[PDB]
Design a protein around this ligand. Structure first.
Ligand SMILES: */C(=C(\CCC)[N+](=O)[O-])c1ccc(-c2cccc(C(=O)O)c2)o1
Ligand SMILES: */C(=C(\CCC)[N+](=O)[O-])c1ccc(-c2cccc(C(=O)O)c2)o1
Lengths: 274, 263
């Protein structure tokens, strides 16, 4: 049945699902409902071109997003800027979620930061998977949907920063994970141990050890139907590393062809040295 | 199938033992000391190398005259030769894996083209320790520092593999564990260009169940080892991508036609 052992683990699972919902306004469940239908009130405004993009800015909040680097002739940059701000947003949330992870705050302050430094993007693109389908991605809190095609056609460099994300989202979404799973999986990602510079690695590993244990049970209980989902899920941590690095490559490029474009501080401190 | 995962294991093990000459247990026998007389010829610098030329006569990879005149070039040169040696040992082990032969010819090739690198490094860990690597069927042992001691790009083509070994070996896996682990890497359903992924995954899924059981029985003590091992698969891709990058700069050197073709 259930033993004292598994029980501790299910409680950890529930504690995290609870923090998860409390930290991310736009969950996978909400996003799915928005993407699939079953709705009359949650349908998004679709953007697939400059005009729709134009009427787009109109129906939805596209200026508290585009930092003051406003009216910047090339739309591509405007878009990129929207994306960047939304990432800073995500970092913040993830940071909020992190603190709730049992044991995380009790660590060396420099390490707390190190885990965030590298775990953050791997997480953003994991969660970003939740707002995408092969056709495109949700934006502005779900109120909108930008076509994968619109993005892919943007100015030479820019029109290339989202494809990898889409490539992964398709694979990853095929795992059919739900919000309660992702909450634990994201936890595991934070408590790595192989992050560069980690002063006291051991305590971090004992934490992750319990999380992996929590995820194993969770996946087994939530997805009997799917065998070795646990394994298949972990293997996916490879795709994340590469997506991350490709992006970084891209930031390098932009930091030159566009020396007039600004960068958000928080995103700066993260990137440096990845 | 509680018993099936055990049979797939012994079989893979049995097969692994037959395909690979230098095993973990053995390589371990050497390195350390435990039951050893044969003791390896250490290569820590230039002259210890030279003496190696004719001693271990490891030169299976050097008789290559008029092109055998510049240390850092012949070592890496050699390294590659032993790689190609490993590839054949791997390709052969592949055929032992239940179902491998039954897959589409082109996919068998593809799994191999994109999997041998990751496996070369996993087994290479068996021949390393923080201070060096076992060469020529374990007759020698080339020191770690002498390698960083290599001039130009040649000073960091083994260092990465060394860092990996250190972390990997920390798992204390044996040949029994590795055998199944190797099979998993091969049966990767996400290699580019495949044609029929289902059969592959079906097999990897079966191999994964075997590994999981193997690790629990062989290491009751070590909690979540299965998880930690699968994570290392990530360490590998980084390493294989990176390695492949050094090959780029390496294009800018030494400035036979069949030799290249060979490689
Ligand atoms: C990049 C991602 C960022 C995820 C943290 N995203 O799809 O949200 C991206 C691509 C396009 C946009 C975007 C364009 C215009 C307006 C917005 C908005 O949130 O208002 C986002 O962001
Ligand atoms: C590189 C590794 C790669 C194995 C597939 N290795 O052979 O352990 C490497 C480093 C040094 C050498 C080497 C130099 C000279 C002679 C030999 C030999 O095996 O006889 C190896 O290879």
């Amino acid at each position: 049945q259930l033993n004292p052992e598994s029980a501790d683990l299910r409680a950890l699972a529930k504690h995290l699902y609870d923090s998860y919902i409390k930290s991310f306004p736009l969950t996978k469940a909400k996003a799915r409902a928005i993407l699939t239908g079953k709705t009359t009130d949650k349908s998004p405004f679709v953007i697939y071109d400059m005009n729709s993009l134009m009427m787009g800015e109109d129906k939805i909040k596209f200026k508290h997003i585009t930092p003051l680097q406003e009216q910047s002739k090339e739309v591509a940059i405007r878009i990129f800027q929207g994306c960047q701000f939304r990432s800073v947003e995500a970092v913040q949330e993830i940071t909020e979620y992190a603190k709730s992870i049992p044991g995380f705050v009790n660590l060396d302050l420099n390490d707390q930061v190190t885990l965030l430094k590298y775990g953050v993007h791997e997480i953003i693109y994991t969660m970003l998977a939740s707002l995408m389908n092969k056709d495109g991605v949700l934006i502005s809190e779900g109120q909108g949907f930008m076509t994968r095609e619109f993005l892919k056609s943007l100015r030479k460099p820019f029109g290339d920063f989202m494809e990898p994300k889409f490539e992964f989202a398709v694979k990853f979404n095929a795992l059919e994970l739900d919000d309660s799973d992702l909450a634990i999986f994201i936890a595991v990602i934070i408590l790595s141990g192989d992050r560069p510079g980690l002063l006291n690695v051991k305590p971090i590993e004992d934490i992750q050890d319990n999380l992996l244990q929590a995820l194993e049970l969770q996946l087994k209980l939530n997805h009997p139907e799917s065998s070795q989902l646990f394994a298949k899920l972990l293997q996916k941590m490879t795709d994340l590393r590469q997506i991350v690095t490709e992006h970084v490559q891209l930031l390098q490029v932009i930091k030159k062809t566009e020396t007039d474009m600004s960068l958000h501080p928080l995103l700066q401190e993260i990137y440096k040295d990845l």
